[PDB]
Amino acid sequence: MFENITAAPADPILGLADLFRADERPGKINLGQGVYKDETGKTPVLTSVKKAEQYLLENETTKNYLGIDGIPEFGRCTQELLFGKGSALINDKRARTAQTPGGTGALRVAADFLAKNTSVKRVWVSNPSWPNHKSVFNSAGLEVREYAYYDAENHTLDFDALINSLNEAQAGDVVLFHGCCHNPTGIDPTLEQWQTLAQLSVEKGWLPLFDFAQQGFARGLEEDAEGLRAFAAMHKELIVASSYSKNFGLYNERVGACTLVAADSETVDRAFSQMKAAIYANYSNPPAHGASVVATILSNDALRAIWEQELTDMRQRIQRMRQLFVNTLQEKGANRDFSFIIKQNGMFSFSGLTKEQVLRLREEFGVYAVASGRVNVAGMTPDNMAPLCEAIVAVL
Amino acid sequence: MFENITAAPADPILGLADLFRADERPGKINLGQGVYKDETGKTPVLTSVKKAEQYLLENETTKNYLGIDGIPEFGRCTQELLFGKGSALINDKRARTAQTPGGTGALRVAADFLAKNTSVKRVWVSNPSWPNHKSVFNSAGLEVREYAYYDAENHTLDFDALINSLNEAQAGDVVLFHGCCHNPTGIDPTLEQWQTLAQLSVEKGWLPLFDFAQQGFARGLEEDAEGLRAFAAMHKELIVASSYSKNFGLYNERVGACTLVAADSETVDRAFSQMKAAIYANYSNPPAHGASVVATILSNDALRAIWEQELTDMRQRIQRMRQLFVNTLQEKGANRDFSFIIKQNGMFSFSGLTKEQVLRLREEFGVYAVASGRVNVAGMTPDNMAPLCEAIVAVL
Numbered sequence: 001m002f003e004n005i006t007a008a009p010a011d012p013i014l015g016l017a018d019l020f021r022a023d024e025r026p027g028k029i030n031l032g033q034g035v036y037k038d039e040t041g042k043t044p045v046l047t048s049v050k051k052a053e054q055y056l057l058e059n060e061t062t063k064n065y066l067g068i069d070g071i072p073e074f075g076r077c078t079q080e081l082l083f084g085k086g087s088a089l090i091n092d093k094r095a096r097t098a099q100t101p102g103g104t105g106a107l108r109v110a111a112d113f114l115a116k117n118t119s120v121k122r123v124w125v126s127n128p129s130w131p132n133h134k135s136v137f138n139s140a141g142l143e144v145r146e147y148a149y150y151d152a153e154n155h156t157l158d159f160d161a162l163i164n165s166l167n168e169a170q171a172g173d174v175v176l177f178h179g180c181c182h183n184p185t186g187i188d189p190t191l192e193q194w195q196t197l198a199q200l201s202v203e204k205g206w207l208p209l210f211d212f213a214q215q216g217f218a219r220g221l222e223e224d225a226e227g228l229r230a231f232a233a234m235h236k237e238l239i240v241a242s243s244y245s246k247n248f249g250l251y252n253e254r255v256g257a258c259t260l261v262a263a264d265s266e267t268v269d270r271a272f273s274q275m276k277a278a279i280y281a282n283y284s285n286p287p288a289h290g291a292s293v294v295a296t297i298l299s300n301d302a303l304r305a306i307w308e309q310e311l312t313d314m315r316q317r318i319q320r321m322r323q324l325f326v327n328t329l330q331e332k333g334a335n336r337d338f339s340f341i342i343k344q345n346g347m348f349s350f351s352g353l354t355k356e357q358v359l360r361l362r363e364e365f366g367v368y369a370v371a372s373g374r375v376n377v378a379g380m381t382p383d384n385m386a387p388l389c390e391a392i393v394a395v396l
Numbered sequence: 397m398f399e400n401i402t403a404a405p406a407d408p409i410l411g412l413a414d415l416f417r418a419d420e421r422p423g424k425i426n427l428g429q430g431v432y433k434d435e436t437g438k439t440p441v442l443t444s445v446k447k448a449e450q451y452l453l454e455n456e457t458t459k460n461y462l463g464i465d466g467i468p469e470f471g472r473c474t475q476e477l478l479f480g481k482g483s484a485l486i487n488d489k490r491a492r493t494a495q496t497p498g499g500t501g502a503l504r505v506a507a508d509f510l511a512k513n514t515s516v517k518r519v520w521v522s523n524p525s526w527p528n529h530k531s532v533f534n535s536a537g538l539e540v541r542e543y544a545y546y547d548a549e550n551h552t553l554d555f556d557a558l559i560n561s562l563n564e565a566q567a568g569d570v571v572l573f574h575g576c577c578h579n580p581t582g583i584d585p586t587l588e589q590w591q592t593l594a595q596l597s598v599e600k601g602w603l604p605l606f607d608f609a610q611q612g613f614a615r616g617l618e619e620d621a622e623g624l625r626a627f628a629a630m631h632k633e634l635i636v637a638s639s640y641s642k643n644f645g646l647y648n649e650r651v652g653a654c655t656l657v658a659a660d661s662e663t664v665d666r667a668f669s670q671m672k673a674a675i676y677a678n679y680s681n682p683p684a685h686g687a688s689v690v691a692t693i694l695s696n697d698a699l700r701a702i703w704e705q706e707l708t709d710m711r712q713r714i715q716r717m718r719q720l721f722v723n724t725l726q727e728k729g730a731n732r733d734f735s736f737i738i739k740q741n742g743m744f745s746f747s748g749l750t751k752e753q754v755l756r757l758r759e760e761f762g763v764y765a766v767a768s769g770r771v772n773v774a775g776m777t778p779d780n781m782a783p784l785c786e787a788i789v790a791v792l
C-alpha cells in the first residue's frame with residue numbers, strides 16, 4: 001500500500017533550522033524561526049508560567065478528561081481578551097469558545113466545522129501569508145484564494161490593491177484577517193482601514209475569520225484587538241482562531257482557541273454543537289496543562305499583572321530592536337532607507353531582501369532569514385546587531 | 397451562514413454524565429464512563445506522574461516547539477512497548493512513530509494519512525465498537541463497515557462469524573483490531589486466534605490498524621502486545637494508534653502515538669513524511685507536557701519500576717472486582733451465570749443487560765451503565781458492590 005507514496009517536499013523552515021544547527025561558525029545568526037528570543041538568544045519559560053505550573057503540580061488531583069470545548073474559565077478569559085470586558089457579544093452570549101491545540105488546531109477545527117456544516121467552499125488569505133493557512137484549509141477540502149496586500153516599493157499596505165482584489169470574493173466566502181502583527185510582513189491595517197474592511201465585508205457577505213497569533217505584540221492587548229472589535233460591532237457572524245503560543249511562551253503545549261460568534265445565543269449554541277462534533281472526530285478533547293496555565297494566570301490578579309509586564313517587556317524589546325536595526329543600518333552605510341521597519345509590528349518584518357540576497361547572507365555570512373525576506377526581529381540583540389547589519393550592508 | 401445548521405444529536409455519554417451529576421441520591425453508582433477509578437471512587441494522578449511533573453517543572457528551560465512527530469525518546473519507548481526490545485522491526489528501522497494528541501488523534505492522523513496518500517476507501521471495525529472510531533474515519537472521508545464479533549448467547553468471541561464477516565473485505569481495506577481489552581465487550585482473541593487473523597489478513601491483503609487504548613490492563617504490558625506482535629511478524633505494512641490515557645492516568649493531557657510500519661526503512665521514511673504533512677495541516681505539532689511525563693517515566697529505571705507497579709495494581713484491582721462481581725451476584729440470588737465476566741479483560745464488560753434493564757437500573761436504582769450494557773468494572777468497589785448487585789438482581 002505504501003510502495004509508491006510520493007515524498008512530502010523538503011520544508012525550508014525545518015531545512016533552514018537544520019542548516020542553522022549544523023553551521024559550525026561561531027557568529028551565525030538565526031532570524032529565520034517563528035518564536036521569541038530574549039536579549040540572550042533564548043526562548044525562556046515565563047516566570048508567570050513557572051509559578052502557574054508549580055501551583056498546578058501542588059493542587060491537581062485528577063487528569064480526567066476536559067469537556068470537548070476545554071476549561072470553561074479559559075474560554076471566558078479568551079473571550080474577554082478578544083472582545084473586551086463589557087462586550088455586548090459576551091453579554092448577549094453570542095460567542096462560544098473551544099480550547100484547541102494551538103492556533104493551528106483552531107484554524108483546522110474552524111475549517112472542518114465550515115466544510116461540514118455550511119456551503120463555504122473557499123477561503124481568501126493575504127499574499128503573502130504564513131504558508132500553513134493554505135495547508136490547513138486545503139486539508140478540509142477548502143479552496144484557498146489570495147488577496148493582494150503588500151506594496152513592495154513602499155513596504156506598506158497596498159490598500160487599494162487589497163480592496164480591488166477582494167471584489168472577486170463571492171457572498172459566502174471566508175476572508176482571513178491577521179488580527180495584528182501580520183505574518184510575514186509586520187504590516188497591519190490602521191483602525192480607519194479596519195473600519196472600512198468591516199463595512200465592505202457586511203456589504204459583500206463575507207464570513208470574517210480572524211487569526212490572532214501575537215495579541216499584545218503590536219501596541220498592547222487591547223489596542224491589538226481593535227480591528228477585530230470593529231468587525232464584531234458590525235457582524236452577526238464571525239470566527240476567531242487565537243494562540244497563546246507567543247504571548248505566554250507556551251509554543252509546545254498547544255494552547256489556542258476557536259471562538260464562534262452568531263446572531264444570537266440560540267444560534268451559536270446550535271452551530272457550536274457541530275463545532276464540537278468536529279473536535280470529537282479529530283482529537284476528542286484538548287490538552288489541559290497549557291490551557292490550565294493560561295487560565296490560572298488570567299484569572300489571578302497577581303499572576304496576570306506579572307504576565308502583563310512580561311508581555312510588555314517582550315513587545316518593547318522588539319520595538320527597541322526595530323529602532324536599533326534601522327539606526328545601525330544607516331551608520332554601517334546602507335544603500336536604502338529602512339525606516340519602514342519602525343512602523344511594522346510584532347515579531348516579523350519583510351526586510352525587502354531578495355531571495356538571492358538571503359541565500360548569500362546564509363552562505364557568506366551565516367545570517368539566516370527566510371527565502372521571502374522575512375526576518376524575526378526578536379532574533380536581533382544588541383550583541384549581534386553590528387555584524388548583522390554589516391553583513392546586510394555588504395549584500396545590498 | 398449559521399442560521400440553519402442542524403444540531404448535533406444529544407450524546408448519551410455526556411448525557412449520562414450530566415444525569416449522573418444532577419442525581420441527588422446518596423448511593424448512586426457510575427459504571428458509565430471510560431476512565432479508571434481506584435477503591436475510593438477517584439481518578440487520581442499517578443505518583444510516578446507527579447514525580448515526573450516535579451522534575452519537568454525544575455528542569456525545563458524552554459517550551460519551544462517540538463518537531464512534528466514529537467519527542468524522539470517518546471517514540472522510541474513507544475516502539476519498544478509495542479514491539480518488544482529486540483524487535484527486528486526496530487532493528488531494521490521499519491517503524492516511525494509520531495506523538496499525537498491522544499489515541500483519537502492517532503486514529504485521525506492515520507485516517508487523514510490514508511485518505512490522502514493511498515487508495516484506501518474503507519475501514520472495517522467490530523460490531524460493536526467504541527462509537528468514536530466511526531466518526532474519526534468518516535471525517536477523513538472513509539467508509540466504515542462492521543464485522544461480526546460478539547456472541548450474545550455465550551458472552552464470547554463469535555470467531556466463525558468474525559472470519560465469515562471479513563471475507564467481504566477487499567484487498568486494500570483497513571481492518572481495525574483492538575489490541576487488547578476490547579471496548580465495549582472486554583473480549584479479546586486468544587494468541588492462537590490472533591495468529592489465524594494474521595494469516596488471513598496477509599492472504600486477503602488487508603492493512604491492519606491496531607488500536608491500543610489499554611495496554612497493560614489485560615495480563616501485562618508484554619502479554620497484551622502479543623496479538624500485535626503476531627501481526628508484526630507476518631506483515632510488511634501496518635499502523636498502530638496507541639494511548640497513554642488509561643495506563644498513565646494522563647487522559648486530559650492527550651498523550652498518544654501513531655506508529656507507521658512499512659517493508660523497509662526507505663519506504664517508511666517516505667510514507668512518514670506525508671504522515672507528518674497530515675499532522676502539519678491539523679494541529680501542527682503535538683503537546684509536550686503529557687508525552688514528556690511519559691518519556692521521563694519510561695526512560696528512568698526508578699520511575700518506570702514505580703509506574704509498572706502502579707499499572708499492575710490497577711490491573712489487579714480490576715481483576716479482583718470482576719471476581720467480587722460474579723461472587724456477589726451468585727449470593728444475592730442472580731438468575732444467570734456471570735462467570736464470563738472473569739474471562740473478560742480490562743476496564744469494560746458487556747453485562748448482557750438489556751437497554752430497558754439499564755434504563756430501569758438508572759431510574760429505580762441510581763445505577764448508571766451505558767445503553768448497550770457496557771459497564772466500567774473500575775467503577776465497582778468493595779463498598780458499592782452489595783447494592784450494585786442487589787439492584788441488578790432486582791431487574792433481571
Ligand SMILES: Cc1ncc(COP(=O)(O)O)c(CN[C@@H](C)C(=O)O)c1O
Binds near residue numbers: 130244
Ligand atoms: C499568523 C499565525 N497563525 C498561527 C500561528 C501558529 O500558532 P500555534 O503555534 O498556536 O499553532 C502562527 C505562528 N507563527 C510562527 C510559529 C511561524 O513563523 O511559523 C502565526 O504567525
Ligand SMILES: Cc1ncc(COP(=O)(O)O)c(CN[C@@H](C)C(=O)O)c1O
Binds near residue numbers: 283498500501607
Ligand atoms: C478502544 C479505544 N480507543 C481510543 C480511546 C481514546 O483514547 P484517547 O483518550 O487517548 O484519545 C479509548 C478510550 N475509551 C474511553 C475513554 C471510552 O469509553 O470513551 C478506547 O477505549
